[PDB]
């Protein structure tokens, strides 16, 4: 467990340094594999539909925002700090404001696993994959629990 905790933090350290490219790749992977998920993101849907040249920059911008939230929550959890405030307002905005089902959130987490296996093939081994999958399963269950309130 303590090994997995260190693997998660070290992995997110490397993701943080390349968050714009990785975040854009995660959003691209999610939207291509799940057009039903892209439909629930109106701004990205219209930029995709119209072949807008601004799409790449906005994918990098928002992809960094998504990864920054995951990185911060992981650092708070595995350091014994209070992450409840971030989990609640992230779940509030996505259930009430953005109206995003939990399954679409899983598509993002599944895309992050697939992107990291491609971007870090010699570091993202079985230990790193199992540790990140455990955190992502934990993150989804926490948001899902806040949904059921
Ligand atoms: C692990 C999954 C996800 C994470 C960590 C995440 C994180 C975030 C964060 C930190 C923000 C900015 C602050 C906020 O609005 O709360 C945001 C905004 C937003 N999210 Fe996500 N999100 C996830 C999944 C999704 C998915 C799958 C969709 C839609 C298909 C979505 C739709 C949106 C929208 C529409 C916004 C507003 C962006 C804007 O107004 O510029 N989220 N998300």
- Dihedral of the alpha carbons of 138, 113, 79, 145, in degrees to the nearest 10: -20
CB 43 within 8 A of CB 62: no
Of 69, 112, 113, the one to substitute when testing ligand 1's pocket (max ligand atoms within 8 A of C-beta) is 69
Cα separation, 39 vs 96, whole angstroms = 17
The neighbour count for residue 65, using CB atoms within 10 Å, is 10
- Cβ neighbors of 107 (< 8 A, separation 6 or more) are 30, 33, 34, 37
CB 46 within 8 A of CB 2: no
Which method, experimentally, gave rise to this model?
A: X-ray
Going along the chain from its start, the domains and CATH numbers come out as 2-147 (1.10.490.10)
Cα separation, 79 vs 100, whole angstroms = 29
First to last CA, the chain: 30
CB 58 within 8 A of CB 43: yes
Closest atom of ligand 1 relative to the 42 alpha carbon: 35
Which contiguous run of DSSP H or E holds residue 149? none
* Max CA distance (Å), the chain: 47
Cα separation, 85 vs 45, whole angstroms = 30
The resolution, in Å, is 2.0
Cα separation, 107 vs 25, whole angstroms = 13
């Amino acid at each position: 467990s303590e090994e997995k905790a260190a693997l998660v933090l070290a992995l997110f350290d490397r993701v943080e340094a390349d968050r714009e490219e990785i975040g854009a790749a995660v959003l691209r992977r999610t939207f291509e594999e799940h057009p039903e998920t892209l439909k629930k993101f109106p701004r990205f849907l219209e930029l995709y539909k119209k072949g807008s040249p601004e799409l790449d920059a906005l994918l990098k911008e928002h992809g960094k925002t998504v990864l920054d939230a995951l990185i911060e929550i992981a650092r708070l959890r595995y350091s014994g700090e209070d992450y409840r405030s971030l989990i609640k307002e992230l779940a509030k905005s996505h259930k009430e404001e953005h109206k995003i089902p939990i399954e679409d959130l899983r598509h993002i987490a599944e895309a992050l696993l697939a992107v990291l296996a491609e971007r870090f093939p010699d570091e993202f081994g079985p230990e790193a994959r199992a540790a990140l999958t455990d955190f992502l399963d934990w993150f989804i269950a926490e948001i899902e629990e806040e949904y059921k309130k």
